[PDB]
Symmetry: C4
Subunit: 138 residues, 4 copies
């Protein structure tokens, strides 16, 4: 398992949407989705939202009016699984640094004093033992 | 109950703004604001800031002066309510992967000792009597 | 003050920069910098990186070769004090629903660490204080 | 050392890619790559993804079509090290507000007891010793 297990998926979301888009607009926007690699590129351009809509979608949408769904969806997914990936890093680097350290040091400072209390506790039975013997010898 | 509230609110924000956008720039910028389902797009584009001003606002404003406020305001709120939403995952993904798991494991370990330092404590008051029995009894 | 202090700072930064566009690209790029409320607008557009130099400072810089310094810096500063501000929100949001009231409940956990402890010791001394009345006899 | 370590890195790439990019495109795309000083510009114009494929890579690519690779890669890395760099600031600011400051408050309410109980303890022996000293007394 893991976090970069998304870098797997994203590039498959990609693979998917590329092939999907290529099958459609290969026909009539072979400028962009002429080929797979072409769609690949385009879709990374779209990933980046560098004229994503006016450049690509809207033209494509004029020809294929529903395409809006394709482009709008790809985006929400593309971006979403990046946000989902990017944060998995905020986390796996956030708590890589002072959060492994602390958990260990308090796992340590805590068993430090189940140590202290418990035995120090003991001398008190050892005392309720020495003294125990003496209300007897009273 | 939860953060889909911002989502909802931010989805409200769309509905709400796409609504006005439709009615106003409808007749002037009809590809952009003719039908709701096309101010929706256009706003989702505006949302993404993909040729947001030069493509849509400037022209909507080169005609309608106040529209600026419309677009600007939409953006600030749009982005802002996500920023708020985005972070609400950084946090809830942080207060889920890390901030929550010890929140339990430390009151889990604190009670382990108020039951032990207070357990200690009985013995110490109980040595108190067995001996307060001896300033007098022995 | 805090987050809202950068807020101010930035909006300072903005006015201070739309200040210049208007004093500066006014005669000539009046679509963008002709007057203030239009630099303001432009500046916000430029902030958000919608056609910022292709649309804007490439043709402004077809005007002035130095102007590049103008739009570039504005961004690196503009973007910069937001990153600074944004972060101040992950921070003052990330330690506000997860990390804030812990320091108060662990103020309080470490609080009885004295209450029990100190009162226990109190007993200890009193034990001794009487035991010592028994070096006195025995 | 610190993290400007990455500022170096990115800035090495920002330099490296413009030098690499003048070599190729200087010839035939002068307005963007016929120099370094405007390559740089362009490359930060590219850094930002303002008309990146559409404005630039595409027509450039049109000429040296494998130019995609240079744009795409640039971008993946340019961005990616700002991600590693931005994160740094998230962490070196989340590890600065409470991470560094609070860790110290705990060094203190940790070492407060190994001192408090040392002597709670201490008094426990003395007590034991007097009774232990009362074995060879009576
Ligand atoms: Ca073309
Ligand atoms: Ca149409
Ligand atoms: Ca005009
Ligand atoms: Ca011109
Ligand atoms: Ca403790
Ligand atoms: Ca454009
Ligand atoms: Ni913590």
């Amino acid at each position: 398992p893991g976090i970069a297990w998304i870098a797997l998926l994203l590039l498959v979301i990609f693979y998917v949407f590329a092939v999907m888009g290529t099958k459609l607009f290969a026909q009539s926007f072979p400028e962009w989705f002429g080929t797979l690699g072409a769609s690949m590129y385009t879709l990374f351009q779209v990933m980046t939202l560098e004229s994503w809509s006016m450049g690509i979608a809207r033209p494509v949408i004029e020809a294929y009016p529903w395409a809006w769904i394709y482009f709008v969806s790809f985006i929400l997914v593309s971006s979403f699984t990046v946000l989902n990936l990017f944060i998995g890093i905020i986390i796996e680097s956030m708590q890589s640094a002072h959060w492994e350290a602390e958990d260990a040091k308090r796992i340590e400072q805590e068993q430090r004093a189940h140590d202290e209390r418990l035995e120090m506790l003991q001398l008190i039975r050892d005392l309720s033992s020495k003294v125990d013997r003496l209300e007897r010898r009273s």
